[PDB]
Amino acid sequence: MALASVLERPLPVNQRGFFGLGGRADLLDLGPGSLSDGLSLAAPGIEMLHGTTTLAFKFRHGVIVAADKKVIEINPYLLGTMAGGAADCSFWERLLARQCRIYELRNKERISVAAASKLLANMVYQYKGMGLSMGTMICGWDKRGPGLYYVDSEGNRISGATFSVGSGSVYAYGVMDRGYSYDLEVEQAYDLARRAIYQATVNLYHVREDGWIRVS
Amino acid sequence: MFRNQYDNDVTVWSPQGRIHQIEYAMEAVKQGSATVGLKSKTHAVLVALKRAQSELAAHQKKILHVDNHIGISIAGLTADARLLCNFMRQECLDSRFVFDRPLPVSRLVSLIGSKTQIPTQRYGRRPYGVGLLIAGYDDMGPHIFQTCPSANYFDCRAMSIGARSQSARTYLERHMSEFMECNLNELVKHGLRALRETLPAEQDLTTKNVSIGIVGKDLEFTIYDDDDVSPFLEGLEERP
Amino acid sequence: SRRYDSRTTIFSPEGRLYQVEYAMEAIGHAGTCLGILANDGVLLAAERRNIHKLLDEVFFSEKIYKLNEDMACSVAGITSDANVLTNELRLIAQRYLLQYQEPIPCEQLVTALCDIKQAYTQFGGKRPFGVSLLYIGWDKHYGFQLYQSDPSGNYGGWKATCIGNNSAAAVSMLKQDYKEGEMTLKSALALAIKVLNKTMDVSKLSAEKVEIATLTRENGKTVIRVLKQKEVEQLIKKHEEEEAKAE
Amino acid sequence: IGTGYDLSASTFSPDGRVFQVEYAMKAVENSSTAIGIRCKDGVVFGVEKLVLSKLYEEGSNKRLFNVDRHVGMAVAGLLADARSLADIAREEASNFRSNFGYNIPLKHLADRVAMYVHAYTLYSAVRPFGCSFMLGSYSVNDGAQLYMIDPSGVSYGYWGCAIGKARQAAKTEIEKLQMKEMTCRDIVKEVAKIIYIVHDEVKDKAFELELSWVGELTNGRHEIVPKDIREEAEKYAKESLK
Amino acid sequence: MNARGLDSIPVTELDLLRKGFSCVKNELLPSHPLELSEKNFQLNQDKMNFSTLRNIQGLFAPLKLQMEFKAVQQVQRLPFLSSSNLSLDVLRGNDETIGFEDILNDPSQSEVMGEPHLMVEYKLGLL
Amino acid sequence: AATFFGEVVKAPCRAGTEDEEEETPEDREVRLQLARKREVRLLRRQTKTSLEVSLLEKYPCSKFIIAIGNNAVAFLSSFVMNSGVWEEVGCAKLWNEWCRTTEAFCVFYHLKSNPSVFLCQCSCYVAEDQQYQWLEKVFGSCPRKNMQITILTCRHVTDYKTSESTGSLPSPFLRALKTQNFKDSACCPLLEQPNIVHDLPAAVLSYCQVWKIPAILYLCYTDVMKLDLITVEAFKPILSTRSLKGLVKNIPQSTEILKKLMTTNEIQSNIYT
Amino acid sequence: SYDRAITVFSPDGHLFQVEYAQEAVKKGSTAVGVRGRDIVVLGVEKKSVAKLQDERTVRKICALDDNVCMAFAGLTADARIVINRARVECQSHRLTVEDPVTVEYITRYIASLKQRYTQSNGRRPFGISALIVGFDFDGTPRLYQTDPSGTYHAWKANAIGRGAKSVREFLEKNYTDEAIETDDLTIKLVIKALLEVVQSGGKNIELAVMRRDQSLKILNPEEIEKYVAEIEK
Amino acid sequence: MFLTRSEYDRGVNTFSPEGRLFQVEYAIEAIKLGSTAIGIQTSEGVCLAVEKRITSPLMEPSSIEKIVEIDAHIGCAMSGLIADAKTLIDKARVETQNHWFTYNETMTVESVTQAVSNLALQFGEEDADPGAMSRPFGVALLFGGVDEKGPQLFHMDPSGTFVQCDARAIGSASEGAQSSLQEVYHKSMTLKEAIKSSLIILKQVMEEKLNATNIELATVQPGQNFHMFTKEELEEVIKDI
Amino acid sequence: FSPYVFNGGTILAIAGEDFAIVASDTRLSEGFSIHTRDSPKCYKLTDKTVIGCSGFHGDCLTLTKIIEARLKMYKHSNNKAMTTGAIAAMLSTILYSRRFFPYYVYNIIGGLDEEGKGAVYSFDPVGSYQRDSFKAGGSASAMLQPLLDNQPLSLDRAMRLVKDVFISAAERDVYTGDALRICIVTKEGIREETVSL
């Protein structure tokens, strides 16, 4: 078996139990493997978030996101929202959190919102048309001030000061469009978010300089 | 004087029909510390002697765990021991997954020999510089096997390998006729007395330099270290 | 010394590449080539080595090659390697034209070939090309140009240079007879004839020992032509008459 | 004298010899002697097995393998190469049976294994094998057959063979037998007697006799000799030594 | 019979300018029934010859053929230049036949070619 | 060895002629500096000054004992020089690949009660081009008529030439080699024929044999070349000879010291288990 | 002996082939780099000038991106490959992260690429060393150095190539916070540092000056002569 | 009866007549060209002190740090070839984050050390995976962290083997530092005096002046993450030693 | 050729302050025919965790074998037995490894945590999971969840509740078995008993 080892290309012919055009070769390796990670090729009930409404807008003092859990705490300084397939959102945002931690360890500096959103969009764009379904809003604060982006499974990636996705999207968006103001105090912003989410039909988060907090 | 040309590779035969690199690799086994392995009608026992770099470092471990009914002991290099241990564990796991039965020790050791024979024939490789002692239990009872860097394995009833193991082998040969009737006690004691012959006449065995591995009819492979060894060391004599 | 000559991937104790040095030394045996840049054209003159009485003349030229509608080249070294390099240059030019729908610039072509030449001095088991090149051409970014390459993979742009046998004397004479910014095509031709006459000590020049190529721009087009024996004979006769009048 | 042309298996001596193969063949004479005798209705093997120490079991490191249901095998030389070649022979027999649905003839198996052995004496990336071996079989439609293969890759049919350290004396002893007209029961004793005669006790402390036949008695199967017959053969050999 | 031949989505947990314009869904299935058959003709032919030769003669023959192929296919030009494949064609038996791979889309006159060092590194397995 | 496929390689030579057969001011300066880098210097550690005269020329000598290797110096330190007053006279400084600094030392002592008895504990390695400088700086040019020299060292068992296997020998064991003028008899069998010994002890014996000085060399072939108790206990029979009869006084305390120092060994690289 | 294979250790633990490769850096033209507060200056001295040559094709200062520069000393043919790979990587990083590249990131990439060629006997290392300057995204000037062995580390002012010890000593003596007060002062400091080895300034010196939020700018002989005259005053 | 020349120390796959691999020994000897590092393991925490060599006042000290952060509870110290340690620290960090992603927990110091050591084992077989390295690494590492079993300290060797040490010193002055450590270490001791003793030994062994700028210090404690001392803390602890 | 076949089953889990209960039926069927009347769907993984799965039978067998192999691998590598949360995370990753060709299995994991309290996790065929106090799965989960919701407790009352829930559900379901198995996880180990139905 030393001559066959020199040829650095293991063919099924060189292995044991070979006869005819096939043989007892595909029935030999039936172990559970050692170590790897990879999705299976294409060929029941899948849990999906249907009756959920979310809301998020940014202003001078930070970013406020509210919903009806339905908010993923990626990092102490990064926040995310799920819409659609729960499993896909959880898996890909866990991958994003791991990537952010690797970046921080390597470069001794926290990643920015734009880079994180781009990384998530790049990961989810490879499987276009396969069947993935997710819609995410990413909140954070970095050296350039507050940031807010929207990423979905169709490759869309946009930035804005006001977003809303859910069953009651139209009503809440209209309310917070009527009541929006960039130079707004924290209390008035809380009141506006509460009123909008109430009219949509309650959680509440607030991202600041040094990480997010929970209001109610 | 005339050997300088034919002892630089394993792909070259000497004019006397000898491969000198295999004989050189067989000498790495004697660079370790002594190990003793014996068996009885029911149990199989491994005893090993541990060394330490200094008083502020933990003693290196010699007895490893392969499966619920197989354990090994190491004397030689370390990287080769780790690679072989990984191979053993993978083979046992695959066999159990596929057939829902434990893998026989004879088949396992045959696989080890077949894998180890290859690097002694092809270019760009070197032989494994490690010797092992294998203790297991299956439908045929206890088993003790020995492995050599020359891809040779033997089926023993009591064996010792390492540095200055001739005294242990002599003791085992002298006391061979009483092993098959002893229970676990006095069998661990015979092993310890055999291992004590590899030391200078002034010093003795403490609880910080001995390891014990036992596998039996209804007892899985277990390793006793540090304070777990005192019950076996209570009854020893004063090195007669 | 003799310990660090085995292959190309060995550094001398003072950081020297002896195999590349020997490959560059291999160029000193081939024929002599010249290149002169003028205000309204560029010039390229070479010495014929195949001069046996029983040889034939079948090809368009012996050492001058055409790579593109706007460029030409001359080789000095091993013919076998020169052929491969010429084919690769033509392929590279056609690839760029297909990609961008525009002719390739001269410096880009030179860099692309020099990368290939350098790749053989880094991976062991191969042998570097023993060829030097001289390039002439016209470009919409810089006009007329003249470049030179060597087996090491280096290159640079010149106004008047020389490669091959007896290169040092030719360079020394050019450095004192070339005047920047005031050279015309006739002056360049006369200077080339004089330099070739001085550097060829075999015998007196004859029209069958040299070949001269001229690149000029005429009515939005680049024309490359090889001078004929009549013109070469007139040039040599005029130079000889000038020398005779000098004394 | 072949100094300078004996460092690779792909180099020819000035008189047209390959010296690595010669050294490999020389390496076989470093092990004990094994013999095999073909008789009227079967083949019987015999190996002089040295004892290294008393700490080993009865059946450790044997030198008689079961290649197939009807084929035996005896080896000499480096043991690891012998195990590898036994695995190769088993694989070849299994492949033939799977393809064509009946027991492989002995000549074909010998040819396959001999060519596999020879393939190693052509390239500089490997080294020649260092072991010889013999094959034996019996069937009703073919009769007994015996073959030998050596490290160079040459196979031949034999009426009686011997490989190892003392093949010359063993061959001299064998050449005085009328094996064409006897029976396995009358050949086991002769094999044991020859093994005992050849053995040297000055340079070898002790040994254990190992025997096995194949033939009409075993109904075309390769088996180990029963213990009582081994004891009787050993007693007869010891008596004949005096 | 030589032309009839018989879960790999890794996640990076073991440059986008270099690779582009490719999705997993399109490459999941072939575009024509003859695509994979034509792309892997030589490999299938070699496999068929090895199978029949191993079944009839033994292990030595396919091993010797593969050893000869590997030895002779190590003295070629670097991958950014075109080779002739003389001795490999002689050994393989294709020195007196012309197929559709020779007269269509001459590989010696391809319209694309990458950087030298990149190809040499990719062939070595580093990238 | 070949670095690429089909490379042309040459066989190594055992006579060493393949390197010196090849025989700018910068090269000469480099050679001079490299030669100056690895010169042998003998100096007194008390004031850090070199001795311009050979060590044995300053002080008369009647007995000289040399130990080479860890085991030999350990044996001498435990058994001989634990029962007296010894003054350090000088030390040697060396540099080479295998001894970067000078665990590595070479220190000379002489007995206070009897200034005619000397000692030397060399644990470093002296290269092949520094042994003659060592001999010149220690012994000088003109030797002395009345002087006896004893040498001790250790060698691995695999260097022994025997018809049987190396592993079958009952290591450790002692062997001896003595010059013509050594009238006494050794306590161990003399070394067999096809076996030779080289390096520094060979240099000392060659000097003593050429210049007609009595000498003897003791060798220990062992299977453990580290600091071990069996190896240093194997040197016990030497104490019965006339060279060491008047220097040993208490055996049990030497054994206790040996046991004490056996517990402060150097840390071995964890390559073997 | 032990200095003919890349992957062979000396008995005292030395890899001599890499040191021999580094020895080739010490023969190239001197390069100087000084980091200011709002400016970064690179200076390379011309080893020799040939009157019949085009100076545009022999420059040793290159631009890797909008905010990164580079200057090398060593093997000219080997420098070009590294420069092209670095440019491709700089452009490819923006495709994955919208932010522009960072000086430490590009230095890490170059060092890893250099180290990849010292791991096998089938290829030889790159005989060059580089100085990299630039500005970060938030506006912090940087300066790094790379070695053929594959190591990098930051500096405030450094010199590589032949005759670098004297220049480094001069920079150590004459570097202070009041000498980098303004762009003119920084440029004059670089010129003064280079003048210690150049036999005659103005003709054997080339400078590249990069300001914050601006592209690379190459000074011309007129400006170089003006600065030389002002220094000589 | 002749003396001849024999060579066995120019290949990674060659055995000496006494079964010794000499290239690995030479790679181990290559460590002695680095800087001294000291690690003391105590029931209250782990201490890591290293000496950094400054070749010029123009360098940035914060760019040649020899103590890195593997994770929130694991440190590291380096000695030997700098370029080689950067391919092992990255492996350690990647393995830690992979384990966290898969199992939603944190690794142990022993597991991290084993995972790193699995990479240094493979060498000399270029016919295997193309990314395999043909020669041993020339760097030694010290690992220090806190886990379920309390504070831990590990040592890894270019041979690819690791043990656990109560107090270890590696680098150029390793033997002298170890001899001094053996005379001062005792189990019932506190972090402050561990710091003081390590600083004293470093001052004794260095060939320069200990001035709170040519050394760096770091500790990890139960309940607090990996922490590196600042300039003021270094000056305060270096005063009166 | 459909590579999926539905087999009946019903599983339940209740988490207590210092105990955990997992129960299931013991019937294997293919809609109309009855394969066996004795086939428990609760498997013991370690001394402190139990898993119960129902759905396609071959997928269940493969999943259990893979889980046991991974447990052995982790024990060998890390020199300790892995906890309940680690098992849950690993199972979620394993399940999502086959997103485009899913396992047709519903899992429920019950056991003790590090602090010594009950823990219950519920999954989906893709891998989403969360911690709960009580969960019902299987075919009859829809008609069984409201009963539990409208109805922590001690061990005896929880067992009483479990018995009445299964006896009420079996009479109204076509896939419930003829026997009920209950596994109790506590600090002293694990014990189980079978109740006839």
From Swiss-Prot, chain B:
| Localization (cell) | Cytoplasm; Nucleus
Matching entries from InterPro entries are given as: Ntn_hydrolases_N, Proteasome_alpha, Proteasome_alpha-type, Proteasome_alpha1, Proteasome_asu_N, Proteasome_sua/b
MF terms (GO), sorted A to Z = lipopolysaccharide binding
In this protein, the residues bearing a glycan are 110
- What switches on its expression? Induced in breast cancer tissue (at protein level). Up-regulated in liver tumor tissues.
Q: Which GO terms describe its cellular component?
A: centrosome; cytoplasm; cytosol; extracellular exosome; nucleoplasm; nucleus; proteasome complex; proteasome core complex
This protein's assembly is summarised as: The 26S proteasome consists of a 20S proteasome core and two 19S regulatory subunits. The 20S proteasome core is a barrel-shaped complex made of 28 subunits that are arranged in four stacked rings. The two outer rings are each formed by seven alpha subunits, and the two inner rings are formed by seven beta subunits. The proteolytic activity is exerted by three beta-subunits PSMB5, PSMB6 and PSMB7. Interacts with NOTCH3. Interacts with ZFAND1.
Family the entry assigns = Belongs to the peptidase T1A family.
The protein, known as: Proteasome subunit alpha type-1
Q: Which organism is it from?
A: Homo sapiens (Human)
Q: What is the lineage of its organism?
A: Eukaryota, Metazoa, Chordata, Craniata, Vertebrata
From Swiss-Prot, chain E:
What lineage does UniProt assign to this protein's organism?
Eukaryota, Metazoa, Chordata, Craniata, Vertebrata
**Similarity section:** Belongs to the POMP/UMP1 family.
Domain of life here?
Eukaryota
Question: Is Nucleotidyltransferase found in the keyword set?
Answer: no
Linked pathology: Keratosis linearis with ichthyosis congenita and sclerosing keratoderma: A keratinizing disorder characterized by ichthyosis, palmoplantar keratoderma with constricting bands around fingers, flexural deformities of fingers and keratotic papules in a linear distribution on the flexural side of large joints. Histological examination of the skin of affected individuals shows hypertrophy and hyperplasia of the spinous, granular and horny epidermal layer.
Per the Swiss-Prot or TrEMBL record, what residue ranges does the short sequence motif High-affinity association with the preproteasome cover? 54-58
Q: Which InterPro entries does the entry link to?
A: Ump1
User: Where does this polypeptide localize?
Assistant: Cytoplasm, Cytosol; Nucleus; Microsome membrane
Q: Which GO terms describe its biological process?
A: proteasome assembly
Crosslink Glycyl lysine isopeptide (Lys-Gly) (interchain with G-Cter in SUMO2): position given as 25
* Listed name of the protein: Proteasome maturation protein
Instruction: Report where it is expressed, by tissue.
Output: Strongly expressed from the basal layer to the granular layer of healthy epidermis, whereas in KLICK patients there is a gradual decrease of expression toward the granular layer.
**Keyword Endoplasmic reticulum recorded:** yes
- Name the gene that codes for it: POMP
Q: What is its main location?
A: cytoplasm
Q: Which UniProt keywords apply?
A: Chaperone, Cytoplasm, Endoplasmic reticulum, Ichthyosis, Isopeptide bond, Membrane, Microsome, Nucleus, Palmoplantar keratoderma, Ubl conjugation
Which Gene Ontology CC terms are recorded?
A: cytoplasm; cytosol; endoplasmic reticulum; membrane; nuclear speck; nucleus
Induction entry: By IFNG/IFN-gamma.
According to its UniProt entry, this protein's organism is Homo sapiens (Human)
From Swiss-Prot, chain G:
Q: Report residues carrying sugar chains.
A: 129
| Induction data | Down-regulated by the ribozyme Rz3'X. Up-regulated in colorectal cancer tissues.
Where is it located? Answer: Cytoplasm; Nucleus
Gene Ontology terms describing biological process = proteasome-mediated ubiquitin-dependent protein catabolic process
Q: What InterPro entries does the entry give? A: Ntn_hydrolases_N, Proteasome_alpha, Proteasome_alpha-type, Proteasome_asu_N, Proteasome_sua/b
Processing after translation: Phosphorylation by ABL1 or ABL2 leads to an inhibition of proteasomal activity and cell cycle transition blocks.
Q: Which GO terms describe its molecular function?
A: identical protein binding
Question: Cross-referenced PROSITE patterns, in alphabetical order?
Answer: PROTEASOME_ALPHA_1, PROTEASOME_ALPHA_2
Provide the primary localization. Answer: cytoplasm
Q: Entry's SUPFAM superfamilies?
A: N-terminal nucleophile aminohydrolases (Ntn hydrolases) (SSF56235)
Phosphotyrosine occurs at 152
Keywords assigned by UniProt, alphabetized: Acetylation, Cytoplasm, Glycoprotein, Host-virus interaction, Nucleus, Phosphoprotein, Proteasome
Q: What is the effect of changing residue 111 to D?
A: Found in patient with severe intellectual disability; uncertain significance
Which residues are annotated with the PTM N6-acetyllysine? 226
Query: Quick one: a GO cellular component term?
Result: nucleus
Function as written in the Swiss-Prot or TrEMBL entry: Component of the 20S core proteasome complex involved in the proteolytic degradation of most intracellular proteins. This complex plays numerous essential roles within the cell by associating with different regulatory particles. Associated with two 19S regulatory particles, forms the 26S proteasome and thus participates in the ATP-dependent degradation of ubiquitinated proteins.
Family per similarity comment: Belongs to the peptidase T1A family.
Q: What is this protein called?
A: Proteasome subunit alpha type-7
From which organism does this entry originate? Homo sapiens (Human)
| Lineage, uppermost ranks | Eukaryota, Metazoa, Chordata, Craniata, Vertebrata
| Gene name for this UniProt entry | PSMA7
Curated annotation (Swiss-Prot), chain H:
**What main location does UniProt list?**
cytoplasm
What is the disulfide pattern of this chain? none
Q: Which GO terms describe its biological process?
A: proteasome-mediated ubiquitin-dependent protein catabolic process
What superkingdom heads the lineage?
Answer: Eukaryota
Q: Which GO terms describe its cellular component?
A: cytoplasm; cytosol; extracellular exosome; extracellular region; ficolin-1-rich granule lumen; nucleoplasm; nucleus; proteasome complex
Q: Which residues carry this modification: Phosphothreonine?
A: 55
Q: Which SMART domains match?
A: Proteasome_A_N (SM00948)
Q: Which residues carry this modification: Phosphoserine?
A: 16, 56, 63
- Check the record and name the Pfam families matching this protein: Proteasome (PF00227), Proteasome_A_N (PF10584)
Sequence positions bearing N-acetylmethionine = 1
Q: Which InterPro entries match?
A: Ntn_hydrolases_N, Proteasome_alpha, Proteasome_alpha-type, Proteasome_alpha_type_5, Proteasome_asu_N, Proteasome_sua/b
Copy out the induction comment. Up-regulated in colon cancer cell lines. Up-regulated in fetal Down syndrome (DS) brain (at protein level). May be the target of the transcriptional activator NFE2L2.
Which PROSITE patterns does this UniProt record tie to the protein? PROTEASOME_ALPHA_1 (PS00388), PROTEASOME_ALPHA_2 (PS51475)
Query: Is Cell cycle one of the keywords UniProt gives this record?
Result: no
Tissue expression pattern: Expressed in fetal brain (at protein level).
Glycan attachment residues as annotated in the record: 198
User: How does this polypeptide assemble, per the annotation?
Assistant: The 26S proteasome consists of a 20S proteasome core and two 19S regulatory subunits. The 20S proteasome core is a barrel-shaped complex made of 28 subunits that are arranged in four stacked rings. The two outer rings are each formed by seven alpha subunits, and the two inner rings are formed by seven beta subunits. The proteolytic activity is exerted by three beta-subunits PSMB5, PSMB6 and PSMB7. PSMA5 interacts directly with the PSMG1-PSMG2 heterodimer which promotes 20S proteasome assembly.
Concerning its family, UniProt says:
Belongs to the peptidase T1A family.
Spell out the NCBIfam families in the cross-references.
PRK03996.1
User: Encoded by which gene?
Assistant: PSMA5
